[PDB]
Design a protein around this ligand. Structure first.
Ligand SMILES: Nc1nc(=O)c2c([nH]1)NC[C@@H](CNc1ccc(C(=O)N[C@@H](CCC(=O)O)C(=O)O)cc1)N2C=O
Ligand SMILES: Nc1nc(=O)c2c([nH]1)NC[C@@H](CNc1ccc(C(=O)N[C@@H](CCC(=O)O)C(=O)O)cc1)N2C=O
Ligand SMILES: Cc1ncc(COP(=O)(O)O)c(/C=N/[C@H](CO)C(=O)O)c1O
Ligand SMILES: Cc1ncc(COP(=O)(O)O)c(/C=N/[C@H](CO)C(=O)O)c1O
Lengths: 442, 442
């Protein structure tokens, strides 16, 4: 007693918008540092009937029965997760149920500290995520600043983590968790030196490696698994999985943390897991361990270095003046434009990037930089030589943005008015569309 | 550089388990009250490339650009959501971003009362959900009892919500939200008298209709939109959608709640929305508005009724002595067996049901009932006449459970030893598999 017509027939209205979305993705130079492209195998898992199943609880400890094939999927995924990040299932455990990166962080923080518990994180403006305790003067913006008491450290004016201020604050504030690992941070992290500040005050070390997850798995960047109590990561960014999250916990360093994490996830926060997500993760985590994926990650860095170098060669400033990972933050001050404007200009051009704060910005509205990353374009097959073109396209957009601001003014409202019917943008979009539209596309 | 070979070659290990799970699903009589079976179109949406897109924020108000087609998809989804539940653009808003029912409830409750705020919900053992404020002696089990301050009202010894208890508590405890709408409750709800109680103490009325959502939409049961400030529903149970949830809010009654709810979801709690989920909901919400789906919902009630009557005809007792909805709770006392044991017995025969507490039960562990529900079997095409067979299978299972208890004792670990290689269970399983395996299967 069901309609089994294909999506096209059953709901043409929506099949259209989706088909449109697919073409936009196909014809864009996507520089969103947190985006990637899932392969057909992952998306078979996300669309699998395994999501009909309620599986509240953990494997071999389910509330309901008929969960034996589910138990095996969840177990394969915890296993593939632990080898992916090159840790022994005797020292580390992992929860594979958190529905997103933000849920994992909240859950793990609650587990470690509880309501009213004290936490430290990097400010959003300096590159921290919302779930790292973010708030401003007039609002507890993230639950992590409301159900917890949070304090936010900054980067120094060169755009680096000011470790000494981290300490000036950690001794003053005496938190139970210090978070590092970031949303928009162009450099590798000194986890060892985070591990020493933690000890000095008896706090847990929380590492959120969602942006750099692949670099950790492939031993290209510092391993936080050597110093951290808890490591979280989304599965959908540089990792190239579905939209989901992982919590890892060091049991050798804190036994009985396993129960704390497992129970904070369920039944404290979530109900039944999304089993199609877990299936999709298992699928990608296999791929993560394969040497063809270390190859991919290596290309992400090569492309990122090549892009940074090419951008500097055309006299564009980058925060910290380069990158160790997959992302660059462009400092636009010398051109007297905002990141807000360049985001709009690149939109008109089928280039996805987003505005970013820079250390000298005293506000998230109208910031003076943009964030770019290479994971998505690398997936599409772009090699180091193609970064020249992307750099070319960005500088060209920067100049047009300068031009249009001179013609229409510095007001965001006014500025945007210049964008439609601009001959140069239309010529540039077509270059973009023609190069993008023909790149390998999963 | 990506691997685009089918799931079958890329990861053959996982495809095997998944194909296994599919067969279990097809060869099972699924009486789990909260389960359903999605059609192929819903699952095309879940596996669509639209989940590559980061969309933090709301429609017309995104942080990133390139979000025009995602904006369209979300707006479509809100619209169908307001349509399906027969509410107006101007009286009701909806947020379609929550990832699951448990997230929607936590998010909505926080929006209404904030940290340390007061809530009243139905105790889990009486049929309320974890996120309705659940705790016990030893632990604040759900975040909804630790983030907030909660009190739990019970059903009477007859299995009905004790409105007198509800009013008496609401007056002594002075809460700001009273939740109704339940996880395991076989009767319709008197929202009118909940609305009345909420007024006497200046409290919000919160209705979680996840189990009955289709009855509310189709005008089969009492309409909570007439009285409630907030209605939540999961999209994946009787509604037959993907795993996700909806928060409805009555603006016309609480101006300024649209903002309080919308910002609770993002950026208080969630990050980027899962766009494949939103698309799938859209796809299913269209279907919900069709009168063919009203037909399906009606079959769900008819079957439920017929199953209740058939069970009674074989001298099986039901809590409240019947059902108004899609679900029955069996009271097993007259047979001196637990629901825990019957669950085990039914697992052996490819019948999914779950143990349930009855009013006389003094704890979640080793309860005296089982909950059965009809939406999944209805999806597969079973009619009123087939309920006789289901009822006969359960009666036969109840009897075998009595025998095995007599042969092996009352300890659950002992009991299970009876199950494998029992001539009767193997005969019964084969009857189940023969009849189930051949029913329509989306
Ligand atoms: N480094 C970084 N961290 C993040 O968490 C993050 C990024 N970047 N990039 C996009 C951004 C979007 N998130 C947000 C969310 C809220 C505010 C904020 O300042 N909150 C105000 C809104 C300002 C206003 O409109 O008045 C608020 O009161 O909610 C800023 C960015 N985001 C990923 O999520
Ligand atoms: N009415 C109802 N509400 C629900 O939320 C619900 C059902 N039924 N049926 C299945 C059940 C599974 N949920 C749970 C979760 C936790 C406990 C519980 O008592 N938690 C203790 C365990 C202590 C013990 O076992 O002695 C804990 O400390 O975690 C019970 C049922 N579930 C859907 O979620
Ligand atoms: C370190 C970290 N933790 C958690 C999340 C949030 O994970 P969810 O989106 O909830 O799965 C992110 C993502 N951040 C922004 C997207 O807002 C991005 O990079 O663009 C993150 O960078
Ligand atoms: C009234 C209500 N609200 C929320 C949820 C939680 O929905 P999530 O699992 O978080 O999408 C449920 C579901 N409950 C159990 C399974 O958890 C079930 O019935 O079997 C529910 O009945």
């Amino acid at each position: 007693m069901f309609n089994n017509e294909p999506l096209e027939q059953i709901d043409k209205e929506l099949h259209d918008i989706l088909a449109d979305e697919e073409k936009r993705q196909r014809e864009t130079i996507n520089l969103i540092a947190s985006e990637n492209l899932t392969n057909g195998a992952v998306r078979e898992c996300l669309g699998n009937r395994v999501s009909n199943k309620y599986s509240e609880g953990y494997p071999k400890k389910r509330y309901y029965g008929g969960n034996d094939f589910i138990d095996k999927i969840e177990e394969l995924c915890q296993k593939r997760a632990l080898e992916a990040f090159n840790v022994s299932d005797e020292e580390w455990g992992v929860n594979v149920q958190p529905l997103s990166g933000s849920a994992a962080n909240v859950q793990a923080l609650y587990a470690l500290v509880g309501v009213k518990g004290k936490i430290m994180g990097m400010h959003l403006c300096s590159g921290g995520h919302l779930t790292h305790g973010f708030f401003d003067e007039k609002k507890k913006v993230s639950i992590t600043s409301d159900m917890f008491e949070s304090k936010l450290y900054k980067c120094n004016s060169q755009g680096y983590v000011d470790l000494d201020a981290v300490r000036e604050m950690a001794l003053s504030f005496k938190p139970k968790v210090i978070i590092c690992g970031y949303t928009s941070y162009p450099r590798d992290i000194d986890y060892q030196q985070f591990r020493q500040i933690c000890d000095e005050v008896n706090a847990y070390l929380f590492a959120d490696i969602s942006h750099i997850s692949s670099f950790v798995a492939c031993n290209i960047l510092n391993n936080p698994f050597l110093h951290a109590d808890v490591v979280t990561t989304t599965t959908h960014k540089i990792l190239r999985g579905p939209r989901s999250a992982l919590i890892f916990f060091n049991k050798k360093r804190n036994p009985g943390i396993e129960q704390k994490i497992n129970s904070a996830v369920f039944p404290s926060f979530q109900g039944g897991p999304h089993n199609n997500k877990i299936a999709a993760v298992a699928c990608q985590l296999k791929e993560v361990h394969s040497p063809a994926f270390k190859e991919y990650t290596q290309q992400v860095l090569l492309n990122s270095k090549a892009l940074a170098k090419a951008l500097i060669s055309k006299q564009i400033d980058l925060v910290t003046n380069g990158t160790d990972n997959h992302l660059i933050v462009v400092d636009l001050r010398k051109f007297s434009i905002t990141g807000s404007k360049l985001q709009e200009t690149c939109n008109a051009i089928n280039v996805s990037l987003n505005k970013n704060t820079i250390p000298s910005d005293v506000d998230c509205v109208s910031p003076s930089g943009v964030r770019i990353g290479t994971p998505a374009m690398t997936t599409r097959g772009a090699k180091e030589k193609d970064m020249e073109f992307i750099a070319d396209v960005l500088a060209r957009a920067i100049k047009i943005t300068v031009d249009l601001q001179e013609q229409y003014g510095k007001k965001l409202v006014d500025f945007k008015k210049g964008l439609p019917g601009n001959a140069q943008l239309q010529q540039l979009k077509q270059e973009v569309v023609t190069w993008a539209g023909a790149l390998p596309f999963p």
